[PDB]
DNA sequence: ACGAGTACATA
DNA sequence: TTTATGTACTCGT
């Protein structure tokens, strides 16, 4: 489409100018397709783990992988609740996303597995697999073990810590490291040479590369934003722009550091309500909020240590819970107590 | 084989005089049986205090002449529903049996606290329609779940926990009826193991009589030991940590009690505790609940109880 | 087939009331119950695998004749205890009485602490309605999962956990029946790891009998018990405790790794062993006990979650060292 | 039928002027019946008014009396249907509420509805189409005079001043007052101030609190003080939670930090007191997820009261600076659902 | 041509050269028929499923196990109603008549075995069903409970079955099996490669099988004909190199909170799992004798807090940053 | 009588 | 909104 994220996606392993070691690893695993075990790709977001999986299916299956359709199936759960989740369909492979609700997500995966496992192997890809609430993983650790000839499981996730030990035990650990500033600068240069961008100085490319912090999708989206706003002219004085989420987190951090009162608590609670209404997971909000708090030069080592300790405590508290408001409110109260 | 009747029915009262407990309620029941214009009542309380036997005795004193057809004994054991109950009530109310002018029919709904809402909504309509012809009665467990307008339309008669005197005199009546040797120490052991309930006291008495015949504290504790709330009370208020650990082990861990039962009892005791501060009580409750979570997840271990009382003593000595 | 084709737990089920040992206080009470003809509603309580259902089956066989199979109805959790099922089965069974040659009827409720509160409200009224010729026996392991009225109406019976006397009597009986020989250290270890359950003892002794290449003319010692049950040796526990308490970090870590790798020892079992041998040693101060208890609870919680074993092993080492650093 | 009818039946108000309390409501009902056939204040045409309020106060009795004085045919040339217990549906009729709404809209007779205090969420069919004649807790003058008349006719005496205590104990339930007087007079005809305490402690009429009302009671600095500890024990606080346990933990979190901490420890500040209570809600977050997970551990429900409703409201408590704050987490899901 | 995770599955009881305490009992009960209910618990990858599959294959041959063995796992429904409607029906019916060919080639017991794999993630109502399901019809069927966490199973069900613990596959117990697999697959290796592979895996022979398969695939793809080196298996396992660990340690020892923060950001952008980092930090600090005892204890507790917080979800970056900051302030 | 859609309670 | 098991209901075939 018109989005820049689909036009520059690699078409085969020849276009994987990201990591020579990872490309050689994929070629080695594609050398013997029959002996391919279950695979687990891990790395920071934007590294292209989905791209590596898709290219691996290209190397294994061959043609017909890029041509796929979308299907919708009905599911039944406890009581009379009915849930709908979209699955993409291809003639050879299949993959299903856990984007549905995380409680009854196990039974949908089970019924898909025993519906497509009635009878060379059919690879299945589970992106963002860390969202499984220890039940879908408990189903997979048996489904892939008992069926190790008809369907091969491909695990796509990051931060394996919520993932249980047996799932990682019956999976292959393959790295997808984030590239340095050089590789992302070169890929941005390739993009702007593919287009017609009036780049004045190469320093702005380095700055827009460093703004992503090891994340290709946000870098490419913000490059498209710069091209649209500045009329395809990447001048040295190009105004840097950031998504409004980081802007409002910076504003909330400034509000906390400038004053420690109760009205500020009400305002930041309202901001938290708005952010959770913006349909965003709370773990990344806590992570980037703690990043913003630690960026202030006024903070001292004892206050920063207390901040990170409370951040870790409320991180495990949020992980062992569902009401994201309580943990964020408690962490903000703790950091305001520490600052005051 | 040839079993004699249990002591429960061997001592089930037939007159209001034999019923033990509070005096005001029983004299009110006797006077309203003498008058005959018995109003609608709701009876609730802890089990084994005379909630349905008093109702049965009152029904006897009211109509002992037409018991088989003028008192509909609607039991909780029988089928219960919004419609199957009201159909039977209507069939029992539409009949034109010529009752005495000073006597009214009694409808008994034993343990009716667990009915649905619509059953109560139909019951209030039937009750207000046929109040002059028939009268209702209830012997429910807890009146909190009973909806308020039914309580308003009826006369609320709530009993209390039986004291030592009435249970003691009932036990002496049982002893003189059975001619069984007894001891005052055995009597006090029985009434302490009765936890207020007198039916449990009768059960322990018959067990003691059958097993040994002599009422002594040792055998009574051998069948029915000390109640868990008070032993957990002593375990939770002990100042010394290792003394508390030894007490809990000897009293609940070597006695076969399940660990989760111990945690639930500790939570209930801390809920009902009044000898310490309220905030300390809340902190004790929350740490006991953390231990409860750690056991309900699957980790049922004596070490969980040990850590629970370690945190208890950490709160006690202000860390 | 019958015998010699059953697990030792079920092969040696007590058919009569004389085969139950360790519960003599309740055994004589129920024997006087059946002899004197005064049997109220029962309520048996105790640890798992502590002779409840075997005792009630033996009592039913002693009381009734050969017709106990087709006349006595026993409902379990697998047989369901729904309120509708109870109302249309148990009430009908208790209401119907055979005209001749009957004293009473017996209904046994096993694992009754698994049904809803409305079910218990139904069962209590079935108990108090047809008790003239029907008795109810209730088996449960959690008294807090049942309504207080059900506990009050039935006669509470608590089974004290089986001591070493009953366990050693059962061991002697099974070795006499199966022609087996045992060593004093083996039976001492069996007492130590019995945990008050006869089923585990029978399973472990069966594993020991199957362990020997030639069961006849062979003796089972403590090492066989430890290797079959997967339990750590007390000498190993003492050595690990001494190494952690006295030796420095590197030597203690190496010794603990060697101890675990010698026979594939488990970290968790070593944890319960060390924590049950701490209290045998007198401690001077008091907050060290609190630290020990909370830290052992935390490491057991982590093990129940999982993780890499060496991390929690070093955690146990640090827990002990920091607790005894005072 | 000598000595057969109940006291609430033999002493029912024969005339409409014999009723006690809600005199303005009685006047409004009389005006609505009078202005029915003429279709000022707009209530004449905005018909199908109900009589809602405390149970057992004479709403059905008042409707019957105003119907019989106007010549309407009593049913439960002018005819009326006095249909009682609107809440008898109990969330039922599965759309029959709409049928009742259209029946209220179009009927040839003055349909009078009687219901108790309204907690059901089925207010939508009757939100703004019917006149809301509100009945409240009655006074203690006309009811007092009726009690004197009943006691005089029944040959027993009672102290005029304790009638306030009897009315407050039952919370304005005239029928319950009559029943209680009959019950006590069956044994103790004389009523004095010595037995008022035991009568009240035996005849307390506990009732639930709309999720907004429980927050005000929970967020009070008196109950957590030394004096209020005995008045409102720890058992009562958890028992209060179970009345609206679905909405109690959400209501406490939205307003616990919006009130001044009247129970501050010396050396404790406002921000630190909230922080010591803000984290405790996250401890109750673990319990709420674990209670209603696939394990279904419902035996842990009383614990969730302390961790999410009591302790957050115990560290900070006092007179709230404004009205009760409704929970906003429910509102945020509506925005996220779109 | 099949993956080594299941192609080399143990098809015989003697093929399982580990946990011989739980193997000799089965071997001796092949001849007899007094097989009690067993509970297979332990670390994952120890071969409990393989052991029970070998026992099932050896007991009932190739057909009586199809006709007798019933399997239920977490993939299928395991509610109380499902248990009542399925396991009760299976246990109530008598065993099938064995074929004439199975009375001479297989010593098949006249009962059946029902396995319950992954019983840890299963409710207590099914537990209430099975406590009497395994006692009412113990004479006609046998029951198996297999779970890596015996703690989830309550005391009753654990006591009813035989607690056959599975020994952890340490570095001194599983060398022979992996070595024999290595010469069976004809892969070159050094003297210490096998010990390093067994040390990296936390008692997971299946994980070691996967690493060996990956190393063999890489060696056959490159085709240079070189033996597998230690650095190769460190790179396959995701183990951080020692120089990066040393520079991380010296940066931590120097304070510099901002420097620690930016280097930790770079280290997590390198894409290395935090569990491996915790393991490497532990094995570096504990073996080193430079630090005094109190520092050793407190850093061990900080590593324990780090991983016992990690395994409950959370973010690896925050946990590792907090760990490094807090050990930098000791 | 039994199967399916329905809402409510779980101290 | 929550989450399986149980209970209850009632209209329909
Ligand atoms: N107040 C009492 N006086 C005499 N016997 C009593 C009394 N309360 C209970 N009993 C005896 O207890 C047995 C029956 O008790 P119930 O009346 O069923 O107990 P309850 O107090 O009514 O509580 P419920 O409604 O049954 S749970 C009979 O043996 C009675 O003799
Ligand atoms: N006192 C005892 N003496 C001898 N064997 C006993 C004794 N108590 C229990 N057992 C043994 O325990 C085995 C299994 O116990 P059961 O009686 O079937 O179950 P239980 O003890 O009632 O506990 P539950 O309810 O099944 S958890 C029996 O086969 C007996 O061999
Ligand atoms: N003001 C009053 N003075 C004297 N008696 C009264 C008064 N109000 C009510 N009563 C009595 O209390 C009874 C209550 O009857 P209803 O009017 O049906 O009660 P209600 O207010 O409609 O509440 P419900 O519908 O019964 S829950 C009347 O029948 C009278 O006997
Ligand atoms: N003792 C052993 N000897 C040889 N191979 C083994 C042994 N234990 C495990 N394996 C290998 O481990 C792989 C899988 O074994 P499994 O039986 O699935 O282990 P597991 O105990 O079932 O792990 P789970 O299911 O996650 S608890 C196979 O390739 C087996 O060959
Ligand atoms: N080797 C590569 N060469 C060119 N583009 C790449 C490469 N790797 C990743 N990309 C870019 O990454 C984008 C897809 O990233 P994605 O797979 O969504 O990351 P993640 O899986 O972490 O979400 C594509 O638009 C593609 O242009
Ligand atoms: Mg009763
Ligand atoms: Mg049993
Ligand atoms: Mg009415
Ligand atoms: Mg397996």
GROMACS .gro file of N, CA and C and ligand atoms in nm, chain C residues 13 52-53 110-111 139 199, chain E residues 131-132 135 160, ligand 7:
model
   34
  672UNK      N    1  -0.655  -5.394   5.114
  672UNK     CA    2  -0.764  -5.314   5.168
  672UNK      C    3  -0.823  -5.384   5.290
  711UNK      N    4  -1.033  -4.391   5.632
  711UNK     CA    5  -1.171  -4.346   5.649
  711UNK      C    6  -1.268  -4.435   5.571
  712UNK      N    7  -1.251  -4.441   5.438
  712UNK     CA    8  -1.341  -4.521   5.356
  712UNK      C    9  -1.324  -4.670   5.381
  769UNK      N   10  -1.878  -3.966   5.060
  769UNK     CA   11  -1.733  -3.958   5.053
  769UNK      C   12  -1.693  -3.828   4.985
  770UNK      N   13  -1.580  -3.771   5.030
  770UNK     CA   14  -1.531  -3.638   4.991
  770UNK      C   15  -1.646  -3.537   4.977
  798UNK      N   16  -1.765  -3.832   5.482
  798UNK     CA   17  -1.620  -3.836   5.474
  798UNK      C   18  -1.571  -3.707   5.410
  858UNK      N   19  -0.053  -4.518   5.219
  858UNK     CA   20  -0.043  -4.539   5.075
  858UNK      C   21   0.099  -4.514   5.024
 1454UNK      N   22  -0.978  -3.891   4.298
 1454UNK     CA   23  -0.940  -3.956   4.424
 1454UNK      C   24  -1.019  -4.085   4.446
 1455UNK      N   25  -1.144  -4.089   4.402
 1455UNK     CA   26  -1.222  -4.213   4.404
 1455UNK      C   27  -1.230  -4.283   4.270
 1458UNK      N   28  -0.971  -4.546   4.295
 1458UNK     CA   29  -0.992  -4.643   4.402
 1458UNK      C   30  -1.112  -4.733   4.379
 1483UNK      N   31  -0.177  -4.134   4.681
 1483UNK     CA   32  -0.235  -4.250   4.614
 1483UNK      C   33  -0.139  -4.310   4.512
 1684LIG    MG1   34  -1.120  -4.212   5.057
   0.00000   0.00000   0.00000
